[PDB]
């Protein structure tokens, strides 16, 4: 429902985009569990069509051919092993549920699928489910191309085909039931909740009808009254017919205005300044905090022409991406999702990356394992932003401050700002083109604190910058606009 169902005191999830199940299981044990991560959003676990032109794009995973748990990430036994191993170290699994459609209406008939199931897209045949012609919306679409021609018409957005994908007749109980049996199988395996893909393309009541069929979570890992966490992917930046509020009664909704506006402010575009973030959250017109799933970027818009366009910050803009993710993880608004990506061979032509369809690192189509090096970074083209010290330590900061109110805001009237969370954490940012040198009230008890952005508290010492907070809570902050990271963060568990 609205509660994430993470283990108590864990406050973020990470999207391990296109990772294989065996690698995620290992990552839960060696890293996510010990480092306090709440959970992992996984790529669609159900069987999809194989796209050979272009060669195995990441987007083929959003074109279902059955609900069998067999993909390039692994098979059902590997998926079950991952969910168990992660739940056992306190890390939940959330599934990307692709339920609005099946594969492209133009895909060829046959067994060119990730588990070898047969399908005949042209004749609306999906025997592995099973689905047939009457289970799709072709008869409802009022457009001439069969596609969505105007986003100011909710009926075409919900009933017509999204980029040529066969649109499921979600008002039918048979269809609502096939989808629920799939989600309930995942709940039985131990999943904690779901990202409902392409929610704007479904009627609010049809999604609720499917949700009404879901069981409570598995009692080997969750208390008996527990409803699955639901976050609906609705892209609503304003100025269109469909609003994110239409879905609030079903569960949380992705707040895409968050990353779009934060990226514009952090880049200092369109006259925006960091000092304007004093009233960040509902004051900027966003949805209620208790209904929001927030993030700086996602797998679609980190490619540059998604929701937010070029203002979206990504790992390619690492210096500013870290400050945006750090501000997000320190601020109380919303439930936070961090991104973990792969690097692809970009190829710009006339200013555009024509290679943005490229799928995960692979050897002849088999996804590469995630290798871990000693500096704790990753190999094999995986970026592993969730392992960057500055992000890992801020997800720990958000756990440490859980519940504490936004407090002690300061700004220099331009792009230097700071704020705390009750008496448990404080963060300071310098996004101006000059030195930050200020005495600030931190709200924290006096002591010597390790800055968790530049280092870590190890034993009774700090490996980075030390911040000396006096008994009245004040501390001297000095941050160069050219520092490795132009922000500092300290909290109760970083005190010596």
């Amino acid at each position, epitope marked *: 429902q609205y509660a994430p169902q993470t283990q108590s005191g864990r406050t973020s999830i990470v999207h391990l985009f296109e990772w294989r199940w065996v690698d995620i299981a290992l990552e839960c044990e060696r890293y996510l569990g010990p480092k306090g991560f709440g959970g992992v959003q996984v790529s669609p676990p159900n069987e999809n069509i194989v796209v050979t032109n272009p060669s195995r794009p990441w987007w083929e995973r959003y074109q279902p051919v059955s609900y069998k748990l067999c993909t390039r990430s692994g098979n059902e036994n590997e998926f079950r092993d991952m969910v168990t191993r992660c739940n056992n170290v306190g890390v939940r699994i959330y599934v990307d549920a692709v339920i609005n459609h099946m594969c492209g209406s133009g895909a060829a008939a046959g067994t060119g699928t990730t588990c070898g199931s047969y399908c005949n897209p042209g004749s609306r045949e999906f025997p592995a489910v099973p689905y047939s012609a009457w289970d799709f919306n072709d008869g409802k679409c009022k457009t001439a191309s069969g596609g969505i021609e105007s986003y100011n*018409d909710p009926y075409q957005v919900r009933d017509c085909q999204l980029v040529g994908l066969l649109d499921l007749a979600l008002e039918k109980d048979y269809v609502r039931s096939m989808i629920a049996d799939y989600l309930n199988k995942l709940i039985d395996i131990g999943v904690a909740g779901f990202r409902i893909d392409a929610s704007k393309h479904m009627w*609010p009541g049809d999604i609720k009808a499917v949700l009404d069929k879901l069981h409570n979570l598995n009692t080997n890992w969750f208390p008996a009254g527990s409803r699955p966490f639901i976050f609906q992917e609705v892209i609503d930046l304003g100025g269109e017919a469909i609003k994110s509020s*239409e879905y*609030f*009664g079903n569960g949380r909704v992705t707040e895409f205005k968050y990353g779009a506006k934060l990226g514009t402010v952090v880049r200092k575009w369109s006259g925006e300044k960091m000092s304007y973030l004093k009233n960040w959250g*509902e004051g900027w017109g966003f*949805m209620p905090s*208790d209904r929001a799933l927030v993030f700086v970027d996602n797998h679609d818009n980190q490619r540059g022409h998604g929701a937010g366009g070029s203002s979206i910050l990504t790992f390619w803009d690492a210096r500013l991406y870290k400050i945006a993710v750090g501000f997000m993880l320190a601020h109380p608004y919303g439930f936070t999702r961090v991104m973990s990506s792969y690097r692809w061979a970009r190829n710009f032509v006339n200013g555009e990356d024509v290679n943005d369809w490229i799928g995960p690192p692979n050897n002849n189509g088999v996804i590469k394992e995630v290798t871990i090096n000693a500096d704790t970074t990753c190999g094999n083209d995986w970026v592993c932003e969730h392992r960057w010290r500055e992000i890992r330590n801020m997800v720990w900061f958000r756990n440490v401050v859980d519940g504490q109110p936004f407090a002690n805001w300061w700004d220099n009237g331009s792009n230097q700002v700071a704020f705390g969370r009750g008496n448990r954490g404080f963060i300071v940012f310098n996004n101006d083109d000059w030195q930050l040198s200020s005495t600030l009230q931190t709200g924290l008890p006096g002591g010597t604190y390790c800055d968790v952005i530049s280092g870590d508290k190890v034993g009774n010492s700090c490996t980075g910058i030390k911040v000396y907070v006096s008994s009245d809570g004040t501390a001297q902050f000095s941050i160069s606009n050219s520092a490795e990271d132009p922000f500092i963060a300290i909290h109760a568990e970083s005190k010596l």
Partner: nanobody, 119 residues
């Protein structure tokens, strides 16, 4: 189907008002209801909503002071606003959202709203 909004007025801080919203004329249609408000110079922001199953959502600034409920009949809702503060002053708009698509159930556009002035 027509959108009918009512209840606006001027009360002093601490007073109450109750807004009403109805999307009547075709009982086969089902509309979920959500109120937004626009103060001069601010944007039109969500404040409270309720779906057909009675599930409520409130923005934090009105929690415990505003109560949204299903009205007299299907496709009707009320927004009981108590302990009004001067910052609650704004033009309020009910936006009915179609819950299920059906032949001849229209999408309803923003209406004119109602004016609420506190103090």
């Amino acid at each position: 189907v027509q959108l009918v909004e009512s209840g606006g007025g001027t009360v002093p801080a601490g007073g109450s008002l109750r807004l009403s919203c109805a999307a009547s004329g075709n009982t086969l249609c089902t509309y979920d209801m959500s109120w937004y408000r626009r103060a001069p110079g601010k944007g039109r922001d969500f404040v409270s909503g309720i779906d057909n199953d009675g599930t409520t959502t409130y923005v934090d600034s009105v929690a415990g002071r505003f109560t949204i409920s299903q009205g007299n009949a299907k496709n009707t809702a009320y927004l009981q606003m108590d302990s009004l503060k001067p910052d609650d002053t704004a033009m309020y708009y009910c936006k009915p959202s179609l819950r299920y698509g059906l032949p001849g159930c229209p999408i309803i556009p923003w209406g004119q709203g109602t004016q609420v002035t506190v103090s």
